[PDB]
Chain A
């Protein structure tokens, strides 16, 4: 009986961790793109817009 309970919990944990990994991969790609964009991207100029 104990072994059966352990297997059920393992399967549920597996699906949950898979979902978390997917979301975290998306976030990592977003951070990479954002840092790349920012890296790609004084009194005289400031006085001009005013």
Chain B
């Protein structure tokens, strides 16, 4: 069930990708914040490894 749902979301998201980079939406903002987080988390993970 989960795999089917993810595939559906991926294809629908692909079909409307051009509309997304027009942006000027709350969802576009959320994506910019998400990029900032992931980077910090991965750096902290590497330091913990060492």
Contacts and interface: CB of A to CB of B under 8 A. Distances in A.
Contacts of B44: 3-4, 7
Interface residues of A, number: 5
Contacts, number: 10
Interface size class of B (residues with CB under 8 A): under 10
Prevailing SS type, chain B contact patch: helix
Contacts of A10: 48
A4 B47 CA distance: 10
B41 interface: yes
Contacts of A3: 41, 44-45, 48
A7 B45 CA distance: 9
Interface of A: 3-4, 6-7, 10
10 contacts: A3-B41, A3-B44, A3-B45, A3-B48, A4-B44, A6-B48, A7-B44, A7-B47, A7-B48, A10-B48
